[PDB]
């Protein structure tokens, strides 16, 4: 009675909101996902069990499910105000998911909810964990991710040794279909860092706060400072994401005329061999807030650790 069919149209926003519950009523949903934790008593990069979330998938004209979810969570009252303030400071960035703060009663009391709109099913941390902890006995997440983004079809896995690199070298072409998604995620990350610096917000960026479309959320561990003096910490993010940048060949679009995958290739003259400025431009475009000096020529390095870092 009410509740489920009233919470549904309260989560339902003002745009189109053709929603369907993910097998729940007014209660939360439990999933098994990967996180990156550091909270003074636990640390690591493992798969924990999420507990406090209600998810509503979205439909469209022909009443078939689509890759869009409304994730609404409940928590205390102080985090409500803190997240609302930070989002109000950060809402104008085009790389931040659209939040919605409301209050709804489950009993005689009224509890607050925070709803995020149009997220994907999996985050970037899920993809990184799936590719860095491969096990052919159970790889359902990787297969689902590959088939939901038109990298292959469901009958591609009926083959045996479909994952091998020596046998079936076509898996490289299959993997190289996520590079554009990764590149757009990198660009949106740079945009988010610029917005955080301009707004005066201090926080650490993790892989599980970004979905596979590039949008950011979860400002629950941030603080506030004077405008223009913000500082993001992006060590673990880039360091963990680095091995995936070459498997998927994310920088293929940089060999075309206007960084567009539909135009012909760039025609360099055969007599050019320096390329010392292009490397700096690429570093400034994709790794702007990585704070450690980068030497395009390793003859200027200070020791072997710097040589490794720049190579």
């Amino acid at each position: 009675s009410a509740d489920a069919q009233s919470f549904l149209n309260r989560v339902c926003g003002v745009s189109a909101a053709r929603l369907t519950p993910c097998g729940t009523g007014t209660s939360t949903d439990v999933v098994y996902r990967a996180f990156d934790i550091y909270n003074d008593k636990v640390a690591g990069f493992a798969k924990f069990l999420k507990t406090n979330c209600c998810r509503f998938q979205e439909k469209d004209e022909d009443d078939n499910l689509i890759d869009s979810y409304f994730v609404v969570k409940r928590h205390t009252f102080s985090n409500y105000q803190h997240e609302e303030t930070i989002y109000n400071l950060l809402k104008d960035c085009p790389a931040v998911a659209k939040h919605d703060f409301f209050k709804f009663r489950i009993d005689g009391d009224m509890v607050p909810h925070i709803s995020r709109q149009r997220l994907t099913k999996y985050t970037m941390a899920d993809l990184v964990y799936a590719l860095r902890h491969f096990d052919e006995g159970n790889c359902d997440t990787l297969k689902e991710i590959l088939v939901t983004y038109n990298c292959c079809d469901d009958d591609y896995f009926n083959k045996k040794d479909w994952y091998d690199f020596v046998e079936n070298p076509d898996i490289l072409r299959v993997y190289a279909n996520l590079g554009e998604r990764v590149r757009q995620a990198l660009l949106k990350t740079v945009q988010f860092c610029d917005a955080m610096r301009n707004a005066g917000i201090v926080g650490v960026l993790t892989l599980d706060n970004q979905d596979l479309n590039g949008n950011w959320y979860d400002f629950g561990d941030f603080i506030q400072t004077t405008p223009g003096s913000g500082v993001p910490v992006v060590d673990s993010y880039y360091s963990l994401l680095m091995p995936i940048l070459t498997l998927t060949r994310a920088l293929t679009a940089e060999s075309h005329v206007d960084t567009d995958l539909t135009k012909p290739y760039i025609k360099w003259d055969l007599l050019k061999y320096d390329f010392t400025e292009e490397r700096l431009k690429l570093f400034d475009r994709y790794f702007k807030y990585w704070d450690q000096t980068y030497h395009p020529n390793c003859v200027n390095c200070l020791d072997d650790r710097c040589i490794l870092h720049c190579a």
């Binding site: 990156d36 934790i37 550091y38 909270n39 003074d40 201090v202 926080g203 650490v204 993790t206 561990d221 603080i223 506030q224 400072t225 004077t226 223009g228 003096s229 500082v231 993001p232 910490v233 992006v234 060590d235 673990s236 807030y289 704070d291 450690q292």
Partner: protein
């Protein structure tokens, strides 16, 4: 949960100048950290308005480094005193995580504006 340095740090004391040996007695709330290998300062605060130099004494005394600073930032503080203004500095080359640490601790333990 990825927090920015739960266990905090302790202390702020000593000196500063603008041209090498201009550090006379004490012109800095040189802030934080006594690491496990020795005293290694992180943040510098200045009730003054323009400084490029400082000199923190440590251990041997003979070894006290003439630190190169960086262009400052300014803010006003919500102290019980009332109107109080400093000009913020960090030791040059301080990586992002350390500045985040000191800024978070300063903002979350003591009140500022």
């Amino acid at each position: 949960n990825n927090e920015l340095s739960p266990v905090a740090l302790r202390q702020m004391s000593c000196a500063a100048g603008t041209t090498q040996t201009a550090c006379t007695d004490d012109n800095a709330l040189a802030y934080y950290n006594t690491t496990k290998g020795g005293r290694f300062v992180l943040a510098l605060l200045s009730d003054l308005q323009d400084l490029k130099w400082a000199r923190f004494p440590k251990s041997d005394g003979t070894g006290t480094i003439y630190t190169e600073l960086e262009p400052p930032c300014r803010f006003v503080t919500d102290t019980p005193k009332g109107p109080k203004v400093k000009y913020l500095y960090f030791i040059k080359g301080l990586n992002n995580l350390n500045r985040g640490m000191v800024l978070g601790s300063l903002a979350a333990t003591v009140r500022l504006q």
